[PDB]
Amino acid sequence: ISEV
Amino acid sequence: ISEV
Amino acid sequence: GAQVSSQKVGAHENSSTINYTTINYYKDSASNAASKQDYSQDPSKFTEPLKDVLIKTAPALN
Amino acid sequence: GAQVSSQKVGAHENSSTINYTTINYYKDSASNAASKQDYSQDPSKFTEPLKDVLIKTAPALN
Amino acid sequence: LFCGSMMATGKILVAYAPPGAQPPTSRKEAMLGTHVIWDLGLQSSCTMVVPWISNVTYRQTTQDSFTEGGYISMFYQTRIVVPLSTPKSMSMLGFVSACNDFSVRLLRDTTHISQSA
Amino acid sequence: DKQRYTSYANANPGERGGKFYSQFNKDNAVTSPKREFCPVDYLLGCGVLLGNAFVYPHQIINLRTNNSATIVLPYVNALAIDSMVKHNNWGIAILPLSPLDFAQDSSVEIPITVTIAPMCSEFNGLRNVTAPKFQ
Amino acid sequence: ACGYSDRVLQLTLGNSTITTQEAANSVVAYGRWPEFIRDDEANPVDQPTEPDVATCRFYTLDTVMWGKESKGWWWKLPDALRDMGLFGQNMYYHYLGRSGYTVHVQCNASKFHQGALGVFAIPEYCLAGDSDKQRYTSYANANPGERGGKFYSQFNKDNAVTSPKREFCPVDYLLGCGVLLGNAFVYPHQIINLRTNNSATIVLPYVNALAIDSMVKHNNWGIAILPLSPLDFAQDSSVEIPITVTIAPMCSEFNGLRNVTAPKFQ
Amino acid sequence: ACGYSDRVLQLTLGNSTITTQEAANSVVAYGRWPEFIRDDEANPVDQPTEPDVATCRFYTLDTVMWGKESKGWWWKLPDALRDMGLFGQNMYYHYLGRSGYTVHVQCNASKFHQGALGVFAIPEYCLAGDSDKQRYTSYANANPGERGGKFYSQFNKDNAVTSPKREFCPVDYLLGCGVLLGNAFVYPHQIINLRTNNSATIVLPYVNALAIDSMVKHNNWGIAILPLSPLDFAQDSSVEIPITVTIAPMCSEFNGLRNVTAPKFQ
Amino acid sequence: QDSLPDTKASGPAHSKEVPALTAVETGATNPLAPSDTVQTRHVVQRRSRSESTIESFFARGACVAIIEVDNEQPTTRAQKLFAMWRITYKDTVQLRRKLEFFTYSRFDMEFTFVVTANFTNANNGHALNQVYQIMYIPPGAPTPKSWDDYTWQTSSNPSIFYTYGAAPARISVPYVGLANAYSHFYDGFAKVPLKTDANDQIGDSLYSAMTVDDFGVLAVRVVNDHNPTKVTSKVRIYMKPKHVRVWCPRPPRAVPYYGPGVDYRNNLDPLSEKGLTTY
Amino acid sequence: QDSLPDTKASGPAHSKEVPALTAVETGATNPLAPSDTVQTRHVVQRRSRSESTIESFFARGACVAIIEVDNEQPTTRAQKLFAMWRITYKDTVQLRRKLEFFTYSRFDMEFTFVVTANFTNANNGHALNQVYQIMYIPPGAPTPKSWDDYTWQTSSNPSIFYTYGAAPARISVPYVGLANAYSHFYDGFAKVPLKTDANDQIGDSLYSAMTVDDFGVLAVRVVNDHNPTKVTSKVRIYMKPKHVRVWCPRPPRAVPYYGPGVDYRNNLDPLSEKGLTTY
Ligand SMILES: CCOC(=O)c1ccc(OCCC2CCN(c3ccc(C)nn3)CC2)cc1
Ligand SMILES: CCOC(=O)c1ccc(OCCC2CCN(c3ccc(C)nn3)CC2)cc1
Numbered sequence A, B: 001i002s003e004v
Numbered sequence C, D: 001g002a003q004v005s006s007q008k009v010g011a012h013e014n015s016s017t018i019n020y021t022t023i024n025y026y027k028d029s030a031s032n033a034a035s036k037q038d039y040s041q042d043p044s045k046f047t048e049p050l051k052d053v054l055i056k057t058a059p060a061l062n
Numbered sequence E: 001l002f003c004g005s006m007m008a009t010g011k012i013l014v015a016y017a018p019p020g021a022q023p024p025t026s027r028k029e030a031m032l033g034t035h036v037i038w039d040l041g042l043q044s045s046c047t048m049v050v051p052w053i054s055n056v057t058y059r060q061t062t063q064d065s066f067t068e069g070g071y072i073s074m075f076y077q078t079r080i081v082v083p084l085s086t087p088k089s090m091s092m093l094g095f096v097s098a099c100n101d102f103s104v105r106l107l108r109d110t111t112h113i114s115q116s117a
Numbered sequence F: 001d002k003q004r005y006t007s008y009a010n011a012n013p014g015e016r017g018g019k020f021y022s023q024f025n026k027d028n029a030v031t032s033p034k035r036e037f038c039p040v041d042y043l044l045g046c047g048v049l050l051g052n053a054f055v056y057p058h059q060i061i062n063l064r065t066n067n068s069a070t071i072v073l074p075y076v077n078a079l080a081i082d083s084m085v086k087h088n089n090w091g092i093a094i095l096p097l098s099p100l101d102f103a104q105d106s107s108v109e110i111p112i113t114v115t116i117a118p119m120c121s122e123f124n125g126l127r128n129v130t131a132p133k134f135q
Numbered sequence G, H: 001a002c003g004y005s006d007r008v009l010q011l012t013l014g015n016s017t018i019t020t021q022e023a024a025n026s027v028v029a030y031g032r033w034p035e036f037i038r039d040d041e042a043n044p045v046d047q048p049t050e051p052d053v054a055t056c057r058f059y060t061l062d063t064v065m066w067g068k069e070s071k072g073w074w075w076k077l078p079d080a081l082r083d084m085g086l087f088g089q090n091m092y093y094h095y096l097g098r099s100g101y102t103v104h105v106q107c108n109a110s111k112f113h114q115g116a117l118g119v120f121a122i123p124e125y126c127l128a129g130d131s132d133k134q135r136y137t138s139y140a141n142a143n144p145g146e147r148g149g150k151f152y153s154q155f156n157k158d159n160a161v162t163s164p165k166r167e168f169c170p171v172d173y174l175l176g177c178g179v180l181l182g183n184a185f186v187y188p189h190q191i192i193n194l195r196t197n198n199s200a201t202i203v204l205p206y207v208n209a210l211a212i213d214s215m216v217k218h219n220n221w222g223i224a225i226l227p228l229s230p231l232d233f234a235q236d237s238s239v240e241i242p243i244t245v246t247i248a249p250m251c252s253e254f255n256g257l258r259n260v261t262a263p264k265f266q
Numbered sequence I, J: 001q002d003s004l005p006d007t008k009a010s011g012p013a014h015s016k017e018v019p020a021l022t023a024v025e026t027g028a029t030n031p032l033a034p035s036d037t038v039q040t041r042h043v044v045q046r047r048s049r050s051e052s053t054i055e056s057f058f059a060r061g062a063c064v065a066i067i068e069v070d071n072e073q074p075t076t077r078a079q080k081l082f083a084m085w086r087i088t089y090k091d092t093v094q095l096r097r098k099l100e101f102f103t104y105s106r107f108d109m110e111f112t113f114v115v116t117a118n119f120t121n122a123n124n125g126h127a128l129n130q131v132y133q134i135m136y137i138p139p140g141a142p143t144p145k146s147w148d149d150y151t152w153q154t155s156s157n158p159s160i161f162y163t164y165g166a167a168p169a170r171i172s173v174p175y176v177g178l179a180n181a182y183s184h185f186y187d188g189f190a191k192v193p194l195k196t197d198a199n200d201q202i203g204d205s206l207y208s209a210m211t212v213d214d215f216g217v218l219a220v221r222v223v224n225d226h227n228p229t230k231v232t233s234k235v236r237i238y239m240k241p242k243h244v245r246v247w248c249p250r251p252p253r254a255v256p257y258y259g260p261g262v263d264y265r266n267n268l269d270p271l272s273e274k275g276l277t278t279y
């Protein structure tokens, strides 16, 4: 995933 | 998964 | 490959950071939805295109 | 079993590598979509099928 | 490609003029643009590269003054000279191909094939 | 009545430049058309209002304040380079925001002189000279 | 060192040697030298025959004469060689056969002669026919053997419905197959430009959608020789020079032996 | 290695390329390659203009025909190029201009033709005149531009005092200047001997007693082409072959910009 | 965090700093705030400019075309069995005005197609459900002469097959410009008249126009063979720019549009009458 | 990264290297670039050949067939209550020409079916929604003689059951060739005439043809029993090659196709008239  |  | 980010919560229910998830299904980036997390900039290039940019308290024409 | 890769971003929104996810649902590979990440090759076998391949600056016929 | 007899000599000017001016009617005008002076000899053939010189990043495949590519023209720099007992006239063959910087985009259907009911 | 009909010769006055008008007087003769521009001042000659032209790079020559204006211009275009003969990149518009006035002499007249310099000029695609028809 | 050249070659196969003092280097079709069927690409299980030097040697076909009116010549492979010594025998005694080839085309003249021959090697060279009838060219007419065939300048349709010739009608600028000749250069080729070279040497791999096939039912390669620029000499309007085609089988292997195939070429 | 030669050259300047398959090496006049004015040899103080690829490229002048009666041709530099694209413009818009050059002279024929051209590059090529009058040749007649001038076999004096032609009278064996032609070889030169070479390539530095000067008032180099041995072919008494002169400016720099000079060539 | 600058508690003044005075001749705008000309309190600002981003401003599907197409018995005269539309945002005025706030733009384009149909004639029996074919024909490609001719074979052109009743058709298109940006205005010509020209029409062109076919056409047809009774239909095209970037700001169109260029004709009086000293 | 080679800043030349000269007799093409024949600047190249990959070139659904099938009262004469189509790309010209740029090909095949229907007669009442049955009959399998006979039981043949109004039917097919590649051209015969043959028809064959039924047929029928009023329908078949590989390049077809082989008949004049020294 990629959490900002 | 498989990330290229 | 899931993308996770914070919603800007307006009207808060009586229940704090709430998130939403996004995943791209298509190879061509044109197919993507709009991210809408848009950064801003200065008016300056338009509001003050001056070679000698001066301070608002000093005489404009010296 | 999810496959994740980088999109080649053309027109960039005012917001950097963006990814897309792919998953195969079927056992038979014929059922699959097209990956479209295709590698290339030399024109050579066609543009120069010569036994003695020569350098472009030297006389073609010596 | 010069397909003349080996006893035939000559010098030729071949040119490319980028668009915008009068298409060349004289060697004098053609001289002024991109050009190769070919000398006929053991190396039978001469290559002129038409260099990508353009305003737009991609030109169109159909005709259009806005994305036009320019002019190609050829002239004798001297003349074909033969000796006696030699054919005074011969053929030149021309060939075209793309250099390695060349690309194409927006796949479409060709006008070069069709079908009737 | 004709749309996008202004001729290359009339679109390009060279050094002489062009002038604005106070109202739209339509070129009426269909038979032998002038194929000229009709630039109306308060519409900036282009269909929008003059008061908003200040969103564009500008200066004001207010006669009690200054003799002159100096605007430096980059090359602006949707391409890195283009045909200068087919296309103008910048336009210079000088409209009197406030009319010329002096003492009480009703026919006052002062000179306006425009001096321009090219900057970082670069050229590609050399060949024979272009001779346009300005006739 | 010593003095070697791109234009001076020696080809030696079996008991045959070719020398050329004026060649234009040599083409290896699609960059692939001829080779034998590998165990992991193998399909018939029976032990193959490999006649080596007795079949892989230079057979010279009957000479053709190039003249001012000459429109073009064409041959098919293996058909051109069906009667060439032990090669033809191996070809007809077995159901299956593969082969690569070295094609050497010969045309000499003088510094005062002129003209350019286009020597073309084509995979699956399907030609157009006679008639209104589609795909009607007969096996006998499709296969001229050594004699080869010729091209024509225009499409003259075989008109007699009653007793049809069942022949090909190969039009030169359409490469006899419905496409334009100027593009035949995408195929493996050389040019015999008389001011530059006496000859052309194209080496050919076995090309096919199968590792091996019936040589009697199917031609793999076609050789097309069309004059790109006409023969011309001094001022003599009826000039005429010989064109000689010499071909050698390469890495020939045969499968499925039985009694000899006797085709009807009548 | 590979196969390179003294006779096969490629000259590439700006958007122009010349190929020769039969040259005779190349001359660099007095051993000096063209160069820009150094700060310690500088004299005008204003920043120079250096147009590079737009002026330093190959301009081909109008072709002249060499025939059995041809006595000789001559051009002056920069005069020959005064109307050559952006070079001529730079030359006339500035008071000062320097330039080096590559001269490429073209004359081809056949193994059966014969003759030898003497290609001469001369510093300060002062020619003799018409008359009894000394140093009377007019600017208009001294400068033919691209058209160049010709040599003569003998001194025919311009006799009419009333309306004088004010022209040059260049006698071939006197190099048109009072000395003998056989000695012109002390000057930078090449010979186009038709059995040996199609062409001559002389590279020229700026030569002058000043770092820079007025190109409009003064020619630095003169190009003289005199047939040392006459044109001859087979037995045809009126043989005729083209001589083409192609010149390129080199390391061109300009000083003292102002309004354009419009000379009177009338 | 995207909120605007907080307001400062500002106090009384007696100084030689005069921010209230300036000189607009210079070309600049005075960067003033309430705290420069009046006493202010401290306000913590929460307001943000999120809806006025270039993306949010254009983020809406706008109607740019109505393509009318019929399905009826192919008779022998002028009919609408198939239609063609030169792709453009200029047939409509609304989006045209928003994009024209800027000189240059670069974006990806989303197209949404609302198809609607109806019966023309009171009654000849009915029709089974119609399938629509929208084909993009890029400049150069063969344009159809007949509703069922070979071009509709569509081997390389993009085509949409829409079924009546289904959710509206939708597709995305990349930035397809021949330049680094789409030009909303072009102060130029595609050809230039040269002195050496034979007639003076050779070098003649439409002012401000660039390519002749600019982006090509959309061809529309009913794939269904004709029913006895006729069905008329309308393909409404909605356009939305996404992943948007814009350059060089221009004043908004103040008078009604008159064709593709900046030409005006009438209603050149945009402003109302109001008295100088009237509120 | 997939961009093309950058352009090199190249300068003036005076050498014995002559790249401008070559000899095309050799069979080769001169590998030249602008920097060999002219002075060039340094350009950083961003352009790529991504759309011209073998996959991208074929990646589009092309119409290769229109199968007409009716649903009406089974009367006693020749009708279209069911139809059969020999699977092929050759009934159409467009995809046929693209695949024919190459001699050999190997790919998986995607089939998309656009079904459309309509009323034939002005009015006999109406029809309830039709379900279509597309059956693949591989060579050897029994071909239907009747629209409702036993072969349609389809116990082992692949069948599609499509419902009118639904999104177009779609399926994938593997590389089904009897060889290591599909041959787009076959310079040969399926039989050879032997001297010992009785009649000369025994060994006779169609030139360039391989198997008689090559890949089999698609049989189409309306599974619905007949309404009073007749419904005519068309199954449009779209073909798309995926996971594509190609061998040995061929020149494009320059004259109109005349049947399955390379045969030509007319319009053998492909090129226009243009003067030698005319631009
Ligand atoms: C020069 C002024 O116009 C524009 O700036 C402007 C106008 C139209 C624009 O749209 C992009 C062009 C085309 C390209 C492709 N296209 C397609 C493609 C496929 C389908 C099914 N339907 N439409 C339709 C739109 C983009 C920009
Ligand atoms: C020899 C020339 O022809 C070809 O190369 C060529 C032509 C057609 C090709 O298609 C593959 C063959 C068939 C195999 C199976 N098939 C099917 C199978 C199931 C269904 C429901 N519908 N269709 C239909 C296509 C593949 C290649």
Ligand SMILES: *C(=O)CCCCCCCCCCCCC
Pocket: A001, B001, C001, C002, C023, C024, C025, C026, D002, D004, D021, D022, D023
């Ligand atoms: C990164 O995305 C890995 C996690 C994927 C989680 C499952 C997603 C299920 C949907 C896959 C969408 C495929 C779209 C082509």
Ligand SMILES: *C(=O)CCCCCCCCCCCCC
Pocket: B001, D001, D002, D023, D024, D025, D026
């Ligand atoms: C690898 O794929 C493991 C991760 C799976 C994430 C959930 C996917 C949900 C969809 C499953 C698709 C099943 C298709 C037959």
